[PDB]
Amino acid sequence: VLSEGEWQLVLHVWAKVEADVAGHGQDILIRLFKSHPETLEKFDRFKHLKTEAEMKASEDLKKHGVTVLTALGAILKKKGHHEAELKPLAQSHATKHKIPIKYLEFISEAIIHVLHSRHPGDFGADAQGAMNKALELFRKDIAAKYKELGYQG
Ligand code: HEM
């Protein structure tokens, strides 16, 4: 469990992400795709993109980054009481999009890196530790749903 102090660190940095949801979202997806090119192949929508400049120029990619971060923010603001928000996401990602849990680890690393880049004053080691713990909780709960449905591996 995260303590209340740990959740406060998470949500204090998240409030700053919300000042520029589209810019953060774009940066996170591009870092994922560049660091782990296998992930791009899961997106029929985006797999025509071949350079960082092309990724940065895509309005549709920017729009999807907003969708991703909006959903993640709604989960974080539940402070662990996220069953209703998380279940539908797990179901779509396991059974429709066919995303392995390992790729959820990769996007978690991309989020942490981008937050460090953009918010160094509010994203010290104590806040990095708290954010890691929040994203671990997210992954643990998705993995349980995957296991029920026959997708943990
Ligand atoms: C923080 C983690 C993630 C969040 C919050 C998230 C959220 C979402 C949301 C809200 C949607 C649209 C509704 C839906 O289809 O369920 C979506 C679509 C999708 N997600 Fe994710 N996602 C995450 C990670 C991933 C990862 C790591 C991958 C692939 C490597 C992925 C692949 C997809 C695909 C392929 C779609 C459909 C896109 C389209 O064709 O419009 N997601 N995701």
Curated annotation (Swiss-Prot):
The EC number of this protein is 1.7.-.-, 1.11.1.-
The enzyme's first-digit EC class, named in words, is oxidoreductase
Q: Catalyzes what? A: Fe(III)-heme b-[protein] + nitric oxide + H2O = Fe(II)-heme b-[protein] + nitrite + 2 H(+); H2O2 + AH2 = A + 2 H2O
- The primary site where this protein sits is cytoplasm
Q: Which InterPro entries match?
A: Globin, Globin-like_sf, Myoglobin
Report the sequence similarity comment from the record: Belongs to the globin family.
Q: Kindly give the PANTHER family that the UniProt entry links to this protein.
A: MYOGLOBIN (PTHR47132:SF1)
Record's protein name: Myoglobin
Organism of origin: Physeter macrocephalus
